[PDB]
Design an enzyme around this catalytic site. Sequence first.
Site, mmCIF file in Angstrom:
data_model
loop_
_atom_site.group_PDB
_atom_site.id
_atom_site.type_symbol
_atom_site.label_atom_id
_atom_site.label_comp_id
_atom_site.label_asym_id
_atom_site.label_seq_id
_atom_site.Cartn_x
_atom_site.Cartn_y
_atom_site.Cartn_z
ATOM 1 N N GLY A 44 40.658 22.811 4.801
ATOM 2 C CA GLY A 44 41.003 24.194 5.040
ATOM 3 C C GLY A 44 41.572 24.790 3.759
ATOM 4 N N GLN A 49 46.961 30.511 -1.412
ATOM 5 C CA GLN A 49 46.902 29.313 -2.249
ATOM 6 C C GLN A 49 46.115 29.503 -3.533
ATOM 7 O OE1 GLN A 49 45.407 26.723 1.151
ATOM 8 N NE2 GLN A 49 46.670 25.257 -0.044
ATOM 9 N N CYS A 92 48.816 18.808 1.527
ATOM 10 C CA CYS A 92 48.482 20.188 1.224
ATOM 11 C C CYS A 92 48.026 20.234 -0.226
ATOM 12 C CB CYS A 92 49.723 21.103 1.387
ATOM 13 S SG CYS A 92 49.475 22.867 1.020
ATOM 14 N N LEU A 93 46.949 20.960 -0.482
ATOM 15 C CA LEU A 93 46.453 21.099 -1.855
ATOM 16 C C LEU A 93 47.436 21.860 -2.779
ATOM 17 C CD1 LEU A 93 42.674 21.649 -1.200
ATOM 18 C CD2 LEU A 93 43.764 19.547 -2.073
ATOM 19 N N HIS A 134 48.236 25.046 10.033
ATOM 20 C CA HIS A 134 48.646 24.801 8.647
ATOM 21 C C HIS A 134 48.319 25.997 7.783
ATOM 22 C CE1 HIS A 134 49.072 22.074 4.949
ATOM 23 N NE2 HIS A 134 48.303 23.072 4.490
ATOM 24 N N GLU A 135 47.099 26.501 7.920
ATOM 25 C CA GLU A 135 46.661 27.662 7.126
ATOM 26 C C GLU A 135 47.402 28.954 7.479
ATOM 27 O OE1 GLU A 135 45.174 26.605 4.681
ATOM 28 O OE2 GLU A 135 44.130 24.813 5.456
ATOM 29 N N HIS A 138 50.632 29.127 5.748
ATOM 30 C CA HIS A 138 50.530 29.621 4.369
ATOM 31 C C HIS A 138 50.611 31.131 4.292
ATOM 32 C CE1 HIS A 138 49.894 26.149 1.807
ATOM 33 N NE2 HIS A 138 48.875 25.675 2.565
HETATM 34 C C1 BB2 Z 1 45.922 18.472 8.365
HETATM 35 C C2 BB2 Z 1 46.500 19.853 8.118
HETATM 36 C C3 BB2 Z 1 46.215 20.337 6.664
HETATM 37 C C4 BB2 Z 1 44.845 20.237 6.181
HETATM 38 C C5 BB2 Z 1 44.509 21.237 5.062
HETATM 39 C C6 BB2 Z 1 44.681 20.671 3.656
HETATM 40 C C7 BB2 Z 1 44.260 21.684 2.580
HETATM 41 C C8 BB2 Z 1 45.293 22.749 2.466
HETATM 42 O O1 BB2 Z 1 46.298 22.598 1.771
HETATM 43 N N1 BB2 Z 1 45.113 23.896 3.135
HETATM 44 O O2 BB2 Z 1 46.202 24.772 3.153
HETATM 45 C C9 BB2 Z 1 43.908 19.416 3.527
HETATM 46 O O3 BB2 Z 1 42.678 19.424 3.408
HETATM 47 N N2 BB2 Z 1 44.708 18.293 3.505
HETATM 48 C C10 BB2 Z 1 44.120 16.948 3.527
HETATM 49 C C11 BB2 Z 1 44.676 16.227 4.708
HETATM 50 O O4 BB2 Z 1 45.846 16.363 5.017
HETATM 51 N N3 BB2 Z 1 43.871 15.371 5.403
HETATM 52 C C12 BB2 Z 1 42.397 15.582 5.387
HETATM 53 C C13 BB2 Z 1 41.892 14.765 6.590
HETATM 54 C C14 BB2 Z 1 43.045 14.755 7.587
HETATM 55 C C15 BB2 Z 1 44.323 14.938 6.758
HETATM 56 C C16 BB2 Z 1 45.079 13.614 6.621
HETATM 57 O O5 BB2 Z 1 45.856 13.192 7.793
HETATM 58 C C17 BB2 Z 1 44.431 16.245 2.199
HETATM 59 C C18 BB2 Z 1 44.066 14.757 2.231
HETATM 60 C C19 BB2 Z 1 43.693 16.997 1.081
HETATM 61 ZN ZN ZN Z 2 47.997 23.761 2.561
#
Ligand code: BB2
Ligand code: ZN
Length: 149
Positions: A44, A49, A92-93, A134-135, A138
């Site tokens: 996401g 961001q 979070c990125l 989550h989004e 933000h």
């Molecule tokens: C889960 C709620 C947030 C997900 C969104 C984020 C990206 C982000 O910062 N959006 O604001 C993401 O891809 N995060 C990934 C993430 O948290 N992962 C991706 C698969 C599931 C989860 C790990 O439990 C990381 C690894 C880049």
């Molecule tokens: Zn995030």
Amino acid sequence: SLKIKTIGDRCLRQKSEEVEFDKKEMSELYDQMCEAMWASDGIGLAAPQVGINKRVIVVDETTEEHGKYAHLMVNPKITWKSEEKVLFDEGCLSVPDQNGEVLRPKSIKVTFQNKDGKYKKWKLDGLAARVVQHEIDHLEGILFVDYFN
Ligand SMILES: CCCCC[C@H](CC(=O)NO)C(=O)N[C@H](C(=O)N1CCC[C@H]1CO)C(C)C
Ligand SMILES: [Zn+2]
Ligand SMILES: [Cl-]
């Protein structure tokens, strides 16, 4: 191309503004947001961001059957949240090298305008419900690390 901003940048804490839907504007923003999201293995992304404080999110829904796809949600708004909550480990990125278990509602209903500017309302659960929450955080200047104190 879009650059993902990280914790320390004030743009992450400024709340984002409601959008008057412009199809050509959103098409280009969508293309760029998806590119930034996938390039960093995200699932996401929210416009603040990348330094754009407008209420626009993308949510991945890549599948083996259809390949890469993402939803555009313009002015996403939660109208309902389940009483039942679930714990999920988030990163979070915009927050390098941090992760943690966050408790959120398991399911939500959300209104938004989609890629074509159509007004939608979806009931979401599982990972989609998680990503959207989550989004939207933000868009309110909230980072997931704020939930640990
Ligand atoms: C889960 C709620 C947030 C997900 C969104 C984020 C990206 C982000 O910062 N959006 O604001 C993401 O891809 N995060 C990934 C993430 O948290 N992962 C991706 C698969 C599931 C989860 C790990 O439990 C990381 C690894 C880049
Ligand atoms: Zn995030
Ligand atoms: Cl799921």
